Amino acid sequence: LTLDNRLAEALPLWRNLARTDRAPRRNIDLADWKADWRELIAALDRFSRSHGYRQPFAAQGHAALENAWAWGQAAENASTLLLKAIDRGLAGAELRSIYLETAALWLDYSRLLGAARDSLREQGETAPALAPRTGQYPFALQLLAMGVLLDAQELIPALVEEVLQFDTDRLLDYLGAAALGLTSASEETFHPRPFGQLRAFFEEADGSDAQALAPYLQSQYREFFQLSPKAQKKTRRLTGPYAWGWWAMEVSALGVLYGWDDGVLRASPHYLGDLVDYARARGD
Amino acid sequence: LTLDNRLAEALPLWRNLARTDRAPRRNIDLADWKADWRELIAALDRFSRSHGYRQPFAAQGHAALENAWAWGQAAENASTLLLKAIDRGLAGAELRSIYLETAALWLDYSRLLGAARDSLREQGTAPALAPRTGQYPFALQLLAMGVLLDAQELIPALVEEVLQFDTDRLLDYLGAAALGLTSASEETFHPRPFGQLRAFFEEGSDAQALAPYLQSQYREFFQLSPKAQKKTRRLTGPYAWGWWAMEVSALGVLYGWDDGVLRASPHYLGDLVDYARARGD
Amino acid sequence: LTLDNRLAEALPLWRNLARTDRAPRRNIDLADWKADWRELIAALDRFSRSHGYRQPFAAQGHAALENAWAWGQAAENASTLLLKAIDRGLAGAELRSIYLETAALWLDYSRLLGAARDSLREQGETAPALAPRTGQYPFALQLLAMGVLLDAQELIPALVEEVLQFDTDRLLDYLGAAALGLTSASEETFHPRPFGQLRAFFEESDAQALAPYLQSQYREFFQLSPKAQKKTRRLTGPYAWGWWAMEVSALGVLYGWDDGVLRASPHYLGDLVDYARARGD
């Protein structure tokens, strides 16, 4: 099978990104952040030195499937690395350098997972590599929204086909629409809290006003993260501390896609205005 | 089938414990401690994110067996996390929350191990903890910390499922109240140090009978160089038991004696004796 | 099968080495070094507590092969721990005790690999444990060169036979020549950059023969940005070999010449040349 990741080459470059002079995008503890960074880099470095990474075609049947799961865990760790890099204030170009490998690892995972399931079938369970109907949704949100925000949308079609197996809902369809050439979107919302609150924007919204998303940012991000952690956990809002975290990635990516004057949204500590700017400038 | 741990829920809360206002229970290097803490949390988090934790029933035959061993290592990690929290000075309530998951992970491990062995038969021998071996300290932690954290409701299940009833005299005395035991094993699985409890057990009460034991088996052992400690026959358990006279401390809870003579020992957990007594009411 | 490593005994000693009074052998960041050291120690500790390490003969067939791979990664981790200890300035005696365990883990890895491959072919990849023709060469270089530099050449014949399965090139044959004899030393060079630049030395007594090699293949290479380094296509081995001209230093010990012109290099291990010489006698 063709594998696209170049993780071993990327790691020494990433390891060096902790040395940045950029300001974080939100209030973080820098000591904690650096230790978190080192842990994720060490996990991915360990994975890169494993037999299952270096010789992924040596196993067959259930052994192949167990190796695929190890790759899937690595893909999650690369998503968390990307998230930590966003928190830290790494600029668009640096984030894109991570995103290309995060996307590649997810795609490679799905291909090895497919190949294992084929091997098992030909020897005589079924969910996609990333099943957005489940709690995994934030990784799919990250893959599509960060694709848009980092001007890497050309990876979205294979991601949607191979990783998600086209099991996308309304928001994911909007995020990937330009990339895939979608003419219609799903009517479903897999996780109505918070994403059902986008219903007004999708159905009644002109796309000529970012104001349509300002109440969404206030209520689903600012007011949510203002609650105690204990209270947050009692609500039904989906959270994704491994890929999505603090960031209104969906609203920010919609700004790139719609091209509107997003000034009203930049007041939000959860909006990624600098990445909106990056994606627009890079696109041109 | 029913797994009792709630590890994914617990981890974020265990992170915040490193932020405590408490003083350590013994002399520790706080930078080294925080680093050991982060390491164990990271390991447990990686386990909570693994396919074998998230889909524990997906594997069969030898694959199920290998997954059970990963759960086994996570249960050991939770025991070490509990030890590190005791060293750090975390109060009874916080320790109890860690213990509940530690015990749950040991039970879940034993149940998955058993299920794996059944799968292996359905296609087409050692218990989760074998106290006769060097794994005794984990069994000592599970029983003694169950007593010291007023969580004795776990002890019967742990004895039956994790230990498969392979207990010696000390383990029997620790579990006596919970099991409705009216007698105890005559055996001692690790005479060094536990054989030195004989004078106490064969007279049963009086905290005084435990004072020499704390002196000779704890203070005078840990005063030796690390190199000299290793040349002695004394059992050690750096992953679950460490510095702490958990057995003596648990006996203070079970017997209810005035433990003043024992509290002078830096190895005695007097604050947890008080916690367990107060919580037992 | 018999296993030579004593990894569980060595670990507590190794974490102790961070407490050294020695100065580093090159400019390093001590905070970064300590975190790297803790990481390797943690990985080796986790491996030492794994079912695959504790019960290595339990798994059969493909499970035995997967277990062997885990031993292979532990061996690599022990090689990286050795390299970090060289950077840190740990003296010859301390490096020697790490090296013995490193070599033992590589040998144990190779034995388990062979046994798994035997289990499979009796149940109805062929590459050696370390294939020096590939990017694995730096681990082979470390094993033979540090064998010489730490006066532990008694390990060389086993390592060449079991770990390399005799797949050695000219430099490796030169490094093992005292231990194994120099009949036909290979004419091959597996990695022309940097090792083809030893051709003059091998074909044409005087340490000056290796002086340009150190400037050109070491001083001039490590002067470059990481980006410029990658463009040269020189083999590197950040997991075992790193900054160190281990080949040149070991040849110092083998040939016995006055290495004065070589100690001018920040990449030369003169204190270890001295150590192996003194210990050899």
Side-chain angles (χ1 to χ4, degrees), chain A residues 2-8 10-20 23-33 35-59 61-153 155-203 205 207-284, chain B residues 2-8 10-18 20-21 23-120 123-124 126-180 182-202 204-207 209-281, chain C residues 3-18 20 22-59 61-120 123-183 185-192 194-203 207-230 232-281:
Chain A
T2 294
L3 303 174
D4 290 337
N5 87 87
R6 296 301 180 260
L7 175 58
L11 278 161
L13 293 71
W14 295 347
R15 180 177 285 113
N16 266 344
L17 295 176
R19 304 187 189 204
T20 187
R25 282 188 180 87
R26 65 189 185 89
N27 183 57
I28 63 169
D29 182 290
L30 289 172
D32 288 346
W33 182 88
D36 289 345
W37 188 256
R38 288 193 59 99
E39 289 168 356
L40 286 158
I41 290 281
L44 289 161
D45 196 294
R46 177 144 327 273
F47 175 64
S48 85
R49 302 298 298 177
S50 69
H51 187 265
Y53 178 75
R54 287 202 248 168
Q55 305 280 343
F57 312 114
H62 197 81
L65 185 62
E66 296 275 11
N67 193 30
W69 296 325
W71 280 71
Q73 191 157 13
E76 295 191 12
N77 294 342
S79 284
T80 312
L81 197 76
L82 179 54
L83 179 64
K84 293 286 164 184
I86 302 168
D87 281 355
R88 184 61 184 77
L90 291 172
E94 288 64 53
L95 291 182
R96 192 184 199 276
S97 85
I98 304 162
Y99 178 79
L100 292 188
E101 296 302 322
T102 308
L105 287 164
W106 278 100
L107 184 58
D108 295 344
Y109 161 52
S110 77
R111 291 163 172 162
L112 294 168
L113 182 61
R117 284 162 170 178
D118 291 343
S119 181
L120 288 167
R121 177 188 67 250
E122 69 217 9
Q123 284 179 358
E125 225 268 327
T126 186
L130 202 44
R133 282 169 195 275
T134 69
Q136 278 184 293
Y137 191 87
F139 295 105
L141 172 61
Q142 188 197 74
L143 283 167
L144 276 51
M146 297 311 97
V148 174
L149 282 167
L150 303 169
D151 184 44
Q153 294 191 47
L155 301 174
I156 287 169
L159 294 168
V160 174
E161 173 176 26
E162 305 197 40
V163 187
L164 313 184
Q165 302 186 2
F166 279 99
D167 193 12
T168 48
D169 74 340
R170 181 169 282 178
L171 173 64
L172 295 177
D173 286 352
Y174 273 74
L175 294 177
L180 280 151
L182 292 182
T183 47
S184 76
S186 174
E187 297 179 356
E188 303 182 74
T189 298
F190 297 162
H191 304 273
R193 279 57 68 158
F195 305 112
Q197 299 295 115
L198 295 175
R199 179 157 153 155
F201 168 83
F202 288 141
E203 297 183 356
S208 62
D209 210 332
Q211 177 61 35
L213 290 174
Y216 180 83
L217 280 180
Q218 179 60 19
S219 81
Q220 302 309 308
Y221 283 83
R222 187 173 147 210
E223 288 171 2
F224 176 67
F225 287 112
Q226 270 173 342
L227 300 174
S228 83
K230 220 164 167 210
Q232 290 180 27
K233 283 143 212 60
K234 289 306 178 193
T235 74
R236 62 207 188 309
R237 191 211 194 261
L238 187 70
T239 64
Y242 294 90
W244 171 27
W246 182 260
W247 302 108
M249 290 183 177
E250 76 294 58
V251 183
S252 314
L254 291 163
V256 176
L257 294 173
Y258 279 79
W260 58 30
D261 185 348
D262 65 1
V264 67
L265 309 178
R266 295 207 176 208
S268 171
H270 305 272
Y271 188 75
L272 292 158
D274 81 283
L275 296 186
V276 175
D277 296 340
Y278 171 76
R280 291 175 168 173
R282 206 181 183 280
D284 276 321
Chain B
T2 289
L3 301 172
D4 295 321
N5 81 87
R6 300 281 176 273
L7 176 65
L11 285 163
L13 287 66
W14 296 348
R15 281 195 190 86
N16 293 332
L17 299 186
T20 184
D21 302 299
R25 285 197 175 77
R26 64 189 183 86
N27 181 56
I28 64 175
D29 179 292
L30 279 177
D32 293 337
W33 180 91
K34 179 58 172 321
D36 290 349
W37 188 254
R38 295 193 50 102
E39 281 173 3
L40 289 154
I41 293 303
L44 288 167
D45 197 292
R46 193 204 179 234
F47 174 69
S48 81
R49 297 301 295 174
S50 70
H51 187 89
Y53 174 79
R54 278 200 257 171
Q55 291 280 104
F57 308 117
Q60 281 78 241
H62 299 285
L65 192 55
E66 288 285 356
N67 185 39
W69 295 319
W71 280 71
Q73 195 158 10
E76 290 191 11
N77 293 344
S79 287
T80 308
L81 194 76
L82 180 55
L83 176 67
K84 290 298 168 171
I86 297 163
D87 277 354
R88 185 65 184 78
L90 288 181
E94 287 59 56
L95 297 184
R96 191 179 197 277
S97 77
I98 294 163
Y99 177 78
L100 290 185
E101 293 301 320
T102 301
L105 284 169
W106 279 99
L107 289 161
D108 288 348
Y109 165 49
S110 64
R111 292 161 179 169
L112 288 170
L113 184 57
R117 292 163 169 182
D118 300 345
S119 175
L120 281 167
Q123 72 184 46
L129 281 174
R132 298 172 184 270
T133 73
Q135 294 183 303
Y136 196 89
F138 291 108
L140 172 57
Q141 187 198 73
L142 283 171
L143 302 198
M145 300 307 303
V147 172
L148 283 160
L149 306 170
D150 187 40
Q152 287 192 51
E153 67 269 16
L154 287 155
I155 287 174
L158 294 163
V159 171
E160 175 208 337
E161 303 184 46
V162 184
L163 308 189
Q164 301 187 25
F165 298 106
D166 200 4
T167 50
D168 72 346
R169 184 176 279 177
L170 171 61
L171 303 177
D172 281 359
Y173 270 82
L174 296 180
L179 285 160
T182 57
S183 67
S185 174
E186 293 176 333
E187 301 190 70
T188 292
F189 293 165
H190 304 271
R192 310 294 155 242
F194 308 105
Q196 290 308 125
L197 297 173
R198 190 179 148 197
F200 171 85
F201 286 143
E202 297 166 12
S205 270
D206 202 341
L210 294 172
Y213 178 81
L214 285 176
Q215 182 60 20
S216 68
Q217 301 310 303
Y218 283 84
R219 182 125 46 174
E220 291 170 354
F221 177 74
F222 290 108
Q223 85 186 26
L224 308 175
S225 77
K227 206 165 262 193
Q229 292 167 35
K230 281 132 205 72
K231 291 306 195 191
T232 78
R233 320 158 292 190
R234 191 219 194 246
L235 181 66
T236 61
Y239 294 93
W241 171 27
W243 180 263
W244 300 105
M246 283 173 180
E247 76 295 62
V248 180
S249 301
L251 297 170
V253 173
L254 298 169
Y255 282 82
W257 50 44
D258 189 306
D259 67 7
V261 58
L262 307 178
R263 268 172 203 242
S265 177
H267 305 271
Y268 188 77
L269 292 158
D271 77 286
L272 297 184
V273 177
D274 296 342
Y275 168 79
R277 285 174 172 174
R279 207 190 174 270
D281 279 313
Chain C
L3 303 175
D4 296 317
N5 86 84
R6 297 291 184 269
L7 172 67
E9 299 162 52
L11 283 155
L13 251 56
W14 296 348
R15 49 170 82 75
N16 234 346
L17 300 175
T20 185
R22 320 280 279 170
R25 283 189 176 82
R26 61 189 185 86
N27 186 18
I28 64 174
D29 182 277
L30 272 183
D32 292 353
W33 179 92
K34 193 174 177 30
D36 287 353
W37 183 258
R38 290 198 52 108
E39 279 172 9
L40 293 155
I41 293 293
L44 288 162
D45 200 295
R46 180 147 205 280
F47 172 73
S48 84
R49 301 296 297 174
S50 67
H51 177 86
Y53 174 82
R54 287 202 249 171
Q55 300 289 337
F57 310 118
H62 186 85
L65 195 55
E66 289 276 0
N67 186 36
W69 297 329
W71 280 73
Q73 188 161 15
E76 283 189 20
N77 292 166
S79 282
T80 304
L81 191 84
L82 178 64
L83 180 59
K84 293 291 165 174
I86 296 165
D87 281 352
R88 186 60 187 79
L90 299 186
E94 284 61 54
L95 292 181
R96 194 179 197 280
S97 81
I98 298 163
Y99 171 84
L100 295 186
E101 291 303 319
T102 302
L105 281 164
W106 277 101
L107 287 165
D108 287 348
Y109 164 48
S110 72
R111 289 166 187 170
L112 291 174
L113 190 57
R117 281 163 175 178
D118 287 341
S119 170
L120 285 167
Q123 272 183 10
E125 298 166 77
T126 188
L130 207 46
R133 294 169 185 273
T134 76
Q136 291 191 292
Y137 194 90
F139 290 104
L141 172 61
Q142 190 199 68
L143 287 166
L144 304 194
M146 302 305 84
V148 178
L149 286 162
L150 299 173
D151 189 42
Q153 294 190 44
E154 68 272 13
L155 278 157
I156 287 176
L159 290 170
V160 176
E161 173 193 14
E162 299 185 53
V163 183
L164 316 178
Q165 302 186 24
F166 304 111
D167 199 10
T168 51
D169 73 344
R170 182 138 77 183
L171 170 59
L172 300 180
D173 283 349
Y174 271 71
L175 294 172
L180 294 165
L182 223 170
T183 281
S186 187
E187 302 178 43
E188 292 190 85
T189 297
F190 298 160
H191 307 271
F195 308 108
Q197 294 299 110
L198 293 171
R199 180 203 216 79
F201 169 85
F202 287 139
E203 305 191 336
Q208 175 62 34
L210 297 168
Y213 182 86
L214 283 175
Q215 172 66 28
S216 80
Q217 299 313 299
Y218 282 87
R219 199 143 75 123
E220 283 163 12
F221 177 76
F222 290 107
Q223 291 205 286
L224 297 172
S225 61
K227 184 176 251 299
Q229 286 174 21
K230 285 280 140 198
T232 61
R233 311 294 295 197
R234 185 210 193 261
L235 184 69
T236 62
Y239 295 93
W241 169 31
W243 180 264
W244 304 109
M246 282 173 186
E247 77 290 65
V248 178
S249 297
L251 291 163
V253 178
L254 295 162
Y255 280 78
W257 34 228
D258 177 357
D259 66 3
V261 295
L262 302 180
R263 310 213 168 200
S265 176
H267 310 262
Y268 192 71
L269 288 161
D271 78 272
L272 299 184
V273 171
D274 290 349
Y275 170 76
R277 280 179 176 163
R279 200 180 184 279
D281 256 41

